[PDB]
Design a protein around this ligand. Sequence first.
Ligand SMILES: [Fe+3]
Length: 440
Amino acid sequence: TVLATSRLHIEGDFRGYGSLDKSPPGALETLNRLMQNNHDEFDMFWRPDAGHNHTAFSLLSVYALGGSSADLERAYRDDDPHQVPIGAVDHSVVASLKDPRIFIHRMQRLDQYSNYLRFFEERIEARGWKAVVVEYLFSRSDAAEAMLGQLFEGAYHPLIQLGFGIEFELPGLVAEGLAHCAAHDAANIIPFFQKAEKLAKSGSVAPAPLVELYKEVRDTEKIRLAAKMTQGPVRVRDGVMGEAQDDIAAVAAKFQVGPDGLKQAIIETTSCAAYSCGGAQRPGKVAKVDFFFMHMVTSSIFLSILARQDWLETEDKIRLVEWKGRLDLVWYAASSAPALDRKWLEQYQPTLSAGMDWRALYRAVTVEPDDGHLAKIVRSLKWAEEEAKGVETSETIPVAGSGWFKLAQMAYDSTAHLPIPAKWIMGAGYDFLWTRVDSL
Ligand SMILES: [Fe+3]
């Protein structure tokens, strides 16, 4: 039977966090047609490692930046390589997923995406998306505890997809995100999250500023060297978690948010992620933004969005930000914990984006051939400027003020007019990766 939940209709004025210019007429109709095509025709996974379908991310971000029909069509065509036929649904498997032990049991299998999608669509059709999200992520059942770890998998893709669903209140997109969450292959980050949290709640770990926990990861050789350059997409599973799970778990336990600390913890995690991106530069090299640090920033807007949901307890909002901050330390370690310096973003001189404001940068991003990350990072950075309105740089907040837009300029300048593989450096701490980066 056709579910109402399967129909993605964005309607009304809402155009997204950090939006500036309204998309011109005709864009909304293009957005709905293409989001619906992507939803019905394509899987969430097009290859085993780094194979997340970005189509929904690229469309919704280009809409938020005020792109027209033609820009959304570019976004869709640019992600053609992301778009493979959606898996056949097994309807007896879908019926069985009502049992929480069969649910848990089939988790972390990529070929299950379509089964979990149909399941979550049926469940949302019956209870609505708010009820289902609390039930499957935040209710501390066994299923929900495993789904919460899964939410951060793949450098934050499930969180990002669920985040988009919640931001635009799209039931079918919330369903895609939950299904993505359930099906994502495991990087052995769940025990990192359990160990760090058990340590944090023990009463015997004093909290420290996140910026000092980045420093400790870099300065602890066993953690810094756990990841290997040529492990590529499995650095976290086979390197950071393989060699140093307990060690990084004891560091991450020091990141602890008090009951009145939610907004500052979002600003703290977002500032340190932006600081990763902008501060991991090398003398004599052009500016490049690390691909992983870029996901640490692109994911950050969705923390801000979950933080503002009426249907979610403040305890559950604080937990989300704790876990994201902690895993940002793992992604830092996975890029070989490069030396960070505030001087690079402070001193950065824009090139292609020199003299633009946010409105002109947004316009330039809407037309730029890209898989969606450029649009995602400039929007998270404009939003970060709003979230952290009035906050200045300090010992704990390393990027603020004009730094947010300066990073956006560096992401545009260092990425525009390049093929996708040349855009983002795949681990800023690995010296060899800089031999393939232009000198000054
Ligand atoms: Fe991505």
